[PDB]
Design a protein around this nucleic acid. Structure first.
Ligand SMILES: [Mg+2]
Ligand SMILES: [Zn+2]
Ligand SMILES: [Zn+2]
Ligand SMILES: [Zn+2]
Lengths: 38, 51, 258, 66, 52, 51, 18, 481, 115, 51, 47
RNA sequence: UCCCCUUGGCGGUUUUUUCGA
């Protein structure tokens, strides 16, 4: 619930920490839903 | 030459023209902590005993 | 030696304020009545709040206080309820207090407005002034937050706490034009004319009146909506009458003990 | 933070008008016009809404206590 | 002793309907710290009722 | 008198006797200095220059 | 440079110091 | 580390900054036209104090580009706005050029003691010594520069009906009468939070510290306190009323067991607001407990105005007793007139009037110092439009008798601040409290329940009195026999 | 912490008399009446009523201390009429004024409302 | 009680006074007695010593 | 008669942390927890 | 002609910073 930061931090961390661009897009899909989810 | 003393109090001051020039308008809590040693005597024993 | 003969003249009468003029009475009596409307006029106000559950950021005392300031529809209720300290039954009951309930929780995503409509009352006669126009904003809640509490409104008067003050604003005035010069203007041309000045615009202030007492006490008693504004005046006269009757009673005790 | 229930000086209830005032504020009304519409003429009452800061809107930004 | 730490409601006097925890108790009075206000009043034990 | 009798309520050493008013007709009026004379104790004798 | 906040660093400390 | 400020560039006796820049900038809400464009375009420049000695600086282009008799004719820069020389605390002051500067300094200092909403997450924080006002307000008279302090959104004070009259003698020598009825309504009411940090820990091999409801049958060091108030966890529950020396955390260290618990500080009397439990850096149980305290402004609490008028609540009178105007307007605060002539805080008067005009006009007034477009005559013109005395005085009717007071009182909305110096944080009394274990003299400080020092200057005063028995008593019989 | 509860401003404790009669020593036919748990609201009206008495030589009142919920009324009358009976009358007639005013405001309202 | 303000410059900085109990947490003092102690009420505090 | 229920931080969910049990939420494992409101009586005058 | 209550004043300290009259 307050884990929007956790999901955002998880998505943000994965994008720079992960060498594939797909992970950032998959997290971005979750991130768009996150506006309603929190 | 300077010590800390029991039976001493400190408080924020405010004006009060209804008090006499030789009077101090003290708060109730301070009086509730500070005490004065009064010797018992037949003249005051009734008062101090009930007190 | 004896009592002067007071008179009354209602100039404006609404359900929110009364503008009236009292004559042939003392300046002290007129100001005392003014003071009584503010301090010595009983009303019912929230003065007891049991917060069963509160997850808002606002503190129970903060919440309670705001609730305490809410005007309640008390016109007949105050005349029948017993003063809170005075009730003979243990604790509280409808005979001496008004029970309130406010159990509200935000579940929708949009913020929930904790209005005065949300103030459940054990009585339909006593509610916040929300009959007919917006509501008293009590709190704003985010999704999942709640506020559950039990409360009692007590019969009290403005001298104890402003919550029991039924008035919005009392515009009291006497000698509208400065005939008694009770106030002397350094420059009378800089001064606006009174709202009740029954005099033409040529002169700045009325000429000095030496042998003439203060009469024509002009009022604008505006209610905060809790009590009807005319009942406020009746209540101030009855309350001042009460203080003097009580004093006469205690004096009879003080004198008969001879 | 949230609208005061009563006018500090006079005692008029001002807690039941903030939402009305915000509705008026959506339009290009000057802060004085809203009070005029709400009928608050004494400056003691007017000061209440003119000076109010609705910070509770900021307080709602915080994660809720389900 | 017995009612120290009990929650009592003041059932009589000016403090009727007040809630406070007791900090002292004698045969006649107890020192009640009010749960609401930051003051501690001494009141008669027959005027006190226990909510616990 | 309605005003004077309010002022004299705040004098401790006043003997309870109203001084003859400085202006008697058309209706009794007291001068501030007249009321102030009740404040002065005993028989004081002094001369100073005002600012 | 910025590392991605990754690693057990306390464990890394404790274990290498053995 | 070079302190510098941006300035307008002046090449001719004409601005580098033309309407095209302004037209772009009024729309800055939509387009982001900014300082970068202005400097990159060479219209503005950052002058450093060392460089400011070789620049010729104008105050305003609208006046320093015309001439009557040429004074300079060689300006190099122009001040953006001279009021920007004031700082953060100094920028809330209305009419600072109408006050004696030392008073401004005192307000600047007093702006640092005013209670208010210091942060939006104040309800989250388990920080020590927090104060927030119930109803702080946006000032009715603002400098156009306090918008940047976001004081409109984070105010510290209340627009209050100040009556500059020595009323009933208690509104005297910086003390000020306050409206009891307004306080009932929460006027200047604030909530004060204190936070207690506590962690259990390994005292040693034989002893380890743990939170527990201590019990007489096993715990040593127990006192007469109500441990019943902690729940079985050994921690006080949020929403439980506490008072001085009440147990807050039942810490116990095993021996049978020693009570090492934490009790509410001396003279506190608060309510547990919230209890947070966690593990510290070391992973030991660690908890921070926050106790809230509603501080009703009482007699003696220190208030200041935005003009250097430090003053204590002298006495509080009910609305029936406060003086009232021709209408039911009573002052919220009565301040002593003798505080003004000595301090020459005319900015105060102008603030009290512009606040009056702002509340009547229904608009936030501008009190930027070097306004030149808003002066007392113009403000008076504004006030004179509302059926009010153009200079603001009013016929007050005595609250006690209702009789008009012969002097028409200057009265109006003025932004007052409540300073943190509440009297209850200072009131102190003693009779055989703890003693310093070395010199066996009463301890020092109110937290240690100490005793007042009877210093040498006080002794010398007794020497001059020749009250030798008193002097001996104080320095021996009443100190360390 | 030291705020007296507001009810102490008007509530009489056990034994406290609402009014206390005291003789004046400085002059004849003079008393000082000490009202407990009172303020200017009740005192000025009584004072003003006493000024209407032709047999009252001196009348005025004070609240010895504003922080004290107690007032002192001083009454001094003619040799043929005690300050006590003057106080009795000053209560007897002030109540009358307020009762008649109650009746006149009540009728003026009932005549104004639906009439 | 003997009443003092900390910048104790002279003999009149420690006059003795009679006590009067009052509510509201503060040491109230007479207006004329303000000058000897040079004790304004903007937030000043005074020490009370009880013999 | 408590298993010692605590309220998580970021979860806002009651978690049972018995004595000597580590304060961690059942979900997200966040280490911050707050004690639940006391069940003791809470009443204010609203003054 | 089985007993059983038995609990009564504990305490950091240095240094530095901030603040009050
Ligand atoms: Mg000072
Ligand atoms: Zn009942
Ligand atoms: Zn108002
Ligand atoms: Zn969790």
């Amino acid at each position: 619930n307050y884990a929007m930061k956790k999901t955002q931090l998880l998505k943000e961390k994965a994008m720079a920490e992960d060498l594939g661009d797909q992970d950032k897009a998959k997290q971005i899909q979750d991130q768009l839903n996150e506006l309603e989810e929190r | 030459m300077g010590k800390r003393v029991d039976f001493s109090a400190r408080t924020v001051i405010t004006p009060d023209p209804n008090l006499s020039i030789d009077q101090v308008g003290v708060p109730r809590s301070i009086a509730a902590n500070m005490t004065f040693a009064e010797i018992v005597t037949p003249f005051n024993i009734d008062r101090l005993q009930e007190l | 030696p004896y009592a002067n003969q007071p008179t009354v003249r209602i100039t404006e009468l609404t359900d929110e304020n009364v503008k009236f003029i009292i004559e042939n009475t003392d300046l002290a009596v007129a100001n005392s009545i003014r003071r009584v409307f503010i301090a010595e006029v009983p009303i019912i106000a929230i003065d007891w709040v049991q917060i069963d559950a509160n997850s808002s950021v606002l503190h129970d005392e903060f919440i309670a206080h705001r609730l305490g300031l809410i005007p309640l529809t008390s016109d007949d209720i105050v005349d029948k309820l017993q003063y809170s300290r005075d009730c003979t039954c243990e604790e509280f009951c409808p005979e001496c207090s008004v029970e309130f309930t406010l159990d509200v929780r935000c579940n929708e995503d949009q913020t929930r407005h904790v209005t005065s409509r949300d103030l459940i009352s054990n009585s339909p006669r006593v509610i916040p002034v929300t009959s007919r126009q917006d509501d008293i904003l009590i709190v704003k809640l985010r999704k999942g937050q709640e506020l559950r509490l039990r409360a009692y409104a007590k019969k009290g008067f403005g001298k104890e706490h402003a919550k029991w003050n039924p008035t919005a604003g009392v515009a009291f005035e006497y000698d509208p034009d400065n005939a008694l010069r009770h106030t002397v203007y350094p420059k009378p041309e800089e001064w606006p004319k009174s709202e009740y000045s029954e005099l033409d615009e040529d002169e700045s202030q009325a000429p000095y009146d030496p042998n003439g007492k203060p009469e024509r006490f002009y009022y604008n008693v505006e209610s905060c909506g809790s009590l009807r504004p005319e009942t406020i005046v009746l209540s101030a006269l009855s309350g001042l009458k009460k203080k003097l009757s009580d004093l006469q009673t205690q004096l009879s005790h003080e004198i008969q003990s001879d | 933070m949230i609208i005061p229930v009563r006018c500090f000086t006079c005692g008029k209830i001002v807690g039941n008008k903030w939402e009305a005032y915000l509705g008026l504020l959506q339009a290009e009304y000057t802060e004085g016009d809203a009070l005029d519409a709400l009928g608050l003429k004494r400056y003691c009452c007017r000061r209440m809404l003119l000076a109010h800061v609705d910070l509770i809107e900021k307080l709602l930004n915080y994660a809720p206590l389900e | 002793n017995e009612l120290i730490g009990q929650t009592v409601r003041i059932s009589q006097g000016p403090y009727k309907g007040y809630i406070g925890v007791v900090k002292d108790a004698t045969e006649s009075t107890a020192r009640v710290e009010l749960h609401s206000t930051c003051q501690t009043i001494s009141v008669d034990r027959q005027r006190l009722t226990t909510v616990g | 008198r309605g005003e004077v009798m309010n002022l004299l309520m705040f004098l401790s050493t006043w003997d309870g006797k109203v001084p003859q008013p400085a202006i008697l007709k058309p209706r009794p009026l007291w001068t501030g200095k007249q009321i102030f004379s009740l404040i002065i104790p005993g028989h004081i004798n002094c001369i100073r220059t005002h600012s | 440079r910025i590392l991605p906040m990754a690693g057990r660093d306390p464990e890394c400390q404790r274990t290498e110091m053995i | 580390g070079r302190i510098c400020r941006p300035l307008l560039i002046v090449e001719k006796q004409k601005l580098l900054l033309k309407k095209r820049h302004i037209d772009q900038l009024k729309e800055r809400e939509y387009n982001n036209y900014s300082w970068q464009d202005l400097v990159a375009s060479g219209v503005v420049e950052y002058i450093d104090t060392l460089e400011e000695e070789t620049v010729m600086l104008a105050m305003t282009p609208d006046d320093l580009q015309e001439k009557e008799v040429a004074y300079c004719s060689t300006y190099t820069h122009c001040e953006i706005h001279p009021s920007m020389i004031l700082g953060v605390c100094a920028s809330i002051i209305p009419f600072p050029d109408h006050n004696q500067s030392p008073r401004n300094t005192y307000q600047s200092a007093m702006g640092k003691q005013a209670m208010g909403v210091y942060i939006t997450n104040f309800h989250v924080r388990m920080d020590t010594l927090a104060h927030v006002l119930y109803y702080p307000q946006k000032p009715l008279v603002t400098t156009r520069s306090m918008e940047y302090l976001r004081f409109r959104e984070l105010p510290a004070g209340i627009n209050s009906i100040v009556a500059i009259a020595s009323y009933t003698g208690y509104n005297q020598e910086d003390s000020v009468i306050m409206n009891r009825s307004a306080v009932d309504r929460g006027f200047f009411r604030s909530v004060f939070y204190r936070s207690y940090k506590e962690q259990e820990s390994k005292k040693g091999f034989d002893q380890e510290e743990v939170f527990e409801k201590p019990t007489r049958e096993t715990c040593q060091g127990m006192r007469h306190a109500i441990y019943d108030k902690l729940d079985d966890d050994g921690l006080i529950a949020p929403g439980v009323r506490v008072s001085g020396d009440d147990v807050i955390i039942g810490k116990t260290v095993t021996l049978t067991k020693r009570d090492c618990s934490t009790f509410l500080r001396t003279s506190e009397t608060g309510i547990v607001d919230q209890v947070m439990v966690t593990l510290n850096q070391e992973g030991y149980k660690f908890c921070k407990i926050r106790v809230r305290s509603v501080r009703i402004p009482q007699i003696g609490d220190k208030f200041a105005s935005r003009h250097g008028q430090k003053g204590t609540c002298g006495i509080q009178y009910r609305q029936e007793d406060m003086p009232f105007t021709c209408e039911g307007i009573t002052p919220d605060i009565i301040i002593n007139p003798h505080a003004i002539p000595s301090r020459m805080t005319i900015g105060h008067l102008i603030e009290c009037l512009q606040g009056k005009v702002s509340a009547n006009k229904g608009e936030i007034g501008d009190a930027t110092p070097f306004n030149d477009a808003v002066n007392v005559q113009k403000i008076s013109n504004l006030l004179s439009d509302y059926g009010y005395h153009l200079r603001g005085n009013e016929v007050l009717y005595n609250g006690f008798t209702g009789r008009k007071i012969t002097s028409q009182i200057f009265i109006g909305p003025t932004y007052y601040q409540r300073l943190k110096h509440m009297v209850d944080d200072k009131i102190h009394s003693r009779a055989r409290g703890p003693i310093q274990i070395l010199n066996r003299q009463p301890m020092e400080g109110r937290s240690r329940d100490g005793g007042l020092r009877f210093g040498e200057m006080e002794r010398d005063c007794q020497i001059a009195h020749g009250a030798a028995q008193f002097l001996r008593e104080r320095l021996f019989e009443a100190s360390d026999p | 912490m030291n705020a007296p509860p507001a009810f102490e401003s008007f509530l009489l404790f056990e034994g406290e008399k609402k009014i206390t009669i005291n003789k004046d020593t400085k002059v004849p036919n003079a008393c000082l009446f000490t009202i407990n748990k009172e303020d200017h609201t009740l005192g000025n009206i009584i004072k003003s009523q006493l000024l209407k008495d032709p047999q009252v030589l001196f009348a005025g009142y004070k609240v010895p201390h504003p922080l004290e919920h107690k007032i002192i009324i001083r009454v001094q009358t003619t040799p043929d009429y005690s300050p006590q009976e003057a106080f009795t009358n000053a209560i007897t007639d002030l109540i009358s004024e307020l009762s008649l005013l109650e009746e006149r405001f009540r009728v003026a309202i009932k005549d104004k409302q639906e009439g | 009680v003997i009443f003092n303000r900390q910048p104790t410059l002279h003999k009149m900085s420690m006059m003795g006074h009679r006590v009067r109990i009052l509510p509201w947490s503060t040491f109230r003092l007479n207006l004329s007695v303000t000058t000897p102690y040079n004790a304004d009420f903007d937030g000043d505090e005074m020490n009370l010593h009880l013999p | 008669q408590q298993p010692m229920i605590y309220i998580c931080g970021e979860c806002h969910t009651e978690n049972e942390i018995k004595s000597r049990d580590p304060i961690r939420c059942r979900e997200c494992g966040y280490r911050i927890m707050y004690k639940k409101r006391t069940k003791r009586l809470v009443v204010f005058d609203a003054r």
